[PDB]
Amino acid sequence: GCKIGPSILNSDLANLGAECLRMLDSGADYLHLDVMDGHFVPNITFGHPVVESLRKQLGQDPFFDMHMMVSKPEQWVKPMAVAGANQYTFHLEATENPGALIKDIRENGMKVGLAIKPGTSVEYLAPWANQIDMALVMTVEPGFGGQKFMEDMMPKVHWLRTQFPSLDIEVDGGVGPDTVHKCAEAGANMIVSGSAIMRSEDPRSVINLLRNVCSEAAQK
Amino acid sequence: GCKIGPSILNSDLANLGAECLRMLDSGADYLHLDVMDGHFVPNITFGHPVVESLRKQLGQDPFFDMHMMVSKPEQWVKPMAVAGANQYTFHLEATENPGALIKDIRENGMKVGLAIKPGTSVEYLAPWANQIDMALVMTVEPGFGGQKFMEDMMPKVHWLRTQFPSLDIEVDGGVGPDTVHKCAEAGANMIVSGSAIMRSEDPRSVINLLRNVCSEAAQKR
Ligand SMILES: O=C(CO)[C@@H](O)[C@H](O)COP(=O)(O)O
Ligand SMILES: O=C(CO)[C@@H](O)[C@H](O)COP(=O)(O)O
Ligand SMILES: [Fe+2]
Ligand SMILES: [Fe+2]
């Protein structure tokens, strides 16, 4: 039950379609699409209009996990749903009312993800863990790709896996073949990887390696 | 002195390099790149990281006109300059001190654009017109492509042309083979056109049509 979702942050953003196509053709389980509004984080990536074009290019079948690093996650729920996103992962730090937002995401037919930044206590998630589909434990400060993996986040992952056996747990930031085992042994089952996968001639082998390390570690 | 800059807002954003390349090959004078942060306008497009990738794909020749529909234009000046943008067009309504921002843009080596929304009186643009390279008169409410041209904006263009004869004046929003006449006769010499060029089977001829109409008006003056 371990899935690999490449991030395209450090890809050729002038050719997102081709970049994502290579990922899917290489056996990626899903695509992790980083949406930044220049406000919640100090960078701007793209929003629902790019997602709409991607969905048209990539077809109906691929799974889009939207990492919504935006200050008003309430605003982009319908636009993302209409564009064809499968999962809407908002930041607990950004919402005025998590309960209302979770409901709205579900009314819009999308799965619900909830992300926390490194400095955010994992216990902030407790009241919500039973209402969401996936918790995203950031392992770098959000805003940029290619940052250093924060191993000190692993106790958050372990705590979530122990307290909520059924919850999908995603890690995001500096995850690659060097750090994936740490994530898997802590309890993560959804693995975002960007820079580590993006340069490869044979992304399929790297993706398979991440997935296999993660699955065998989970089998324990 | 008339120039046509297609907008790629309603293009295939998953294939943005390809869309820009074919605009350039079709004779575009420049590329007009719409940057929206979801705050200044209710939509999000892309920012400096996409510009960087485009500059790498297109090379150093093409001119990028950055339409900065962002609420903190001060924040993105350096990042856009580093990404390879040529001109930074910010909104008058998006800053408390346009004078300081204008200075910072030039210090970062870029050309300076200054834009006003339809609801914003052209009078407020005037104090800065002698300090900028290009004034942008919006002819639709910013945030979305394919909207209807607001011909009621033409007196803004005409007034700027009269008061600032050497100023480059851009119009943006619903400009096409029909409405370009109004823009040209009013005094605009820089034409942004999105849906009219992008959804055309013959972008070259559309671009030629827009430039020719504008030149004819430019000559008459
Ligand atoms: O959300 C983010 C950054 O804000 C992550 O998705 C990064 O894009 C992960 O990329 P690498 O750290 O694997 O390069
Ligand atoms: O800045 C904008 C919209 O905010 C323009 O650049 C749009 O791209 C309008 O293009 P048209 O499709 O109306 O020509
Ligand atoms: Fe992410
Ligand atoms: Fe524009």
Description:
Two copies of one chain form a homodimer. Chain A is an alpha/beta fold and 220 residues long. Chain A has one domain (1-220): Aldolase class I (TIM Barrel, Alpha-Beta Barrel). Chain A contains eight helices and eight strands. Chain A has helices at 16-25, 48-58, 77-83, 98-107, 154-163, 180-186, 195-198, 203-219, and strands at residues 3-6, 31-36, 64-69, 87-91, 111-116, 134-138, 168-172, 190-193. In chain A, strands 1-8-7-6-5-4-3-2 form an eight-stranded parallel sheet. In chain A, α1 crosses α2 (48-58) and α6 packs parallel to α8 (203-219). The longest helix of chain A is centred in the C-terminal third of the chain and has 17 residues, at 203-219. The first copy, chain A, is globular, with a radius of gyration of 16 Å. The first copy, chain A, starts with a strand and ends with a helix. Chain A binds chain B through residues 9, 12-18, 20, 35-39, 42-50, 52-54, 56-58, 70-72, 75-76, and chain B through 9, 12-18, 20, 35-39, 42-50, 52-54, 56-57, 70-72, 75-76. The complex binds 5-O-phosphono-D-xylulose (2 copies) and fe (ii) ion (2 copies). Residues 7, 9-10, 32, 34, 67, 140, 142-147, 172-175, 192-196 of chain B line the site of one 5-O-phosphono-D-xylulose. Residues 7, 32, 34, 67, 172, 192 of chain B line the site of one fe (ii) ion.
